[PDB]
Structures are given as structure tokens and as C-alpha cells.
Design a protein around this ligand. Structure first.
Ligand code: NA
Length: 129
């Protein structure tokens, strides 16, 4: 599923991401834009041989099982394929664990490089939430 911007903002807010670990809704929407372009089916291979899955490009190195990432963990206890669903529940549940791991949203290199310190409220502008 390719989410619309306000459509994803609503879904994230319903699933309690708005101000989760102190990160406002616009931070999450911004991260999703630059990680996946709001596409739940987005996959990208990393240089280390792990893969990033779904709207928030969650990494098989630590967070989900894809069966092809040697010496990797599955800390969200989910198949990485579950992170590609039209229903973002799994991605949001897993993202809550990631952002709690100690470095906040710096875990998402695209958030640090493209969203951090920017006017992230622009990403929820005009949305009925
Ligand atoms: Na894994």
C-alpha cells in the first residue's frame, strides 16, 4: 500500500506514535517519507547483507527475521514480511521498541540526515487528525 501523507499521519496517531518517546507525529511521517515514500512494500538491501522492510525500513540485523541475515536478532519477534502489510500495526509496534533502544530516532539514518531539526510539523499540515 502507498499511503497518502495525512492517511499515514492518522494511522500512526491511532497507533499511539504521536509524541511516543517525545517524538511528535511530524517526525514519524517525515521518517516514513524518506525511508519508504509511504510504501508499505518498500525493501532495500544494506551493505552488511541485512535488509530494511516496510514504511519505516526496519532492519533484519536486529528487529525482524528474514532467514538470510547471519548472526542477526529478531527483537520484535516477527517475520520481516509482516512489516510489508497494508496494516501498519507490526511496523508501529516494532518502531516503538527501536526508538526506546537508547538513541531515539537517530536509529533511522534518514531521520537524522533529513528530518532532525527541520520543521517536521509541515508533514501533518492540512491533516484532519
Ligand atoms: Na534478523
Amino acid at each position: 500500500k502507498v499511503f497518502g501523507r495525512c492517511e499515514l499521519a492518522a494511522a500512526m496517531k491511532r497507533h499511539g506514535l504521536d509524541n511516543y518517546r517525545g517524538y511528535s507525529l511530524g517526525n514519524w511521517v517525515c521518517a516514513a517519507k524518506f525511508e519508504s515514500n509511504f510504501n508499505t512494500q518498500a525493501t532495500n538491501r544494506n551493505t552488511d547483507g541485512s535488509t530494511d522492510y516496510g514504511i519505516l525500513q526496519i532492519n533484519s540485523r536486529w528487529w525482524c527475521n528474514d532467514g538470510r541475515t547471519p548472526g542477526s536478532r529478531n527483537l520484535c519477534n516477527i517475520p520481516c514480511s509482516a512489516l510489508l502489510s497494508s496494516d501498519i500495526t507490526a511496523s508501529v509496534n516494532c518502531a516503538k521498541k527501536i526508538v526506546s533502544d537508547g538513541n531515539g530516532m537517530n536509529a533511522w539514518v534518514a531521520w537524522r540526515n533529513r528530518c532532525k531539526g527541520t520543521d517536521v510539523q509541515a508533514w501533518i499540515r492540512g491533516c484532519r487528525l
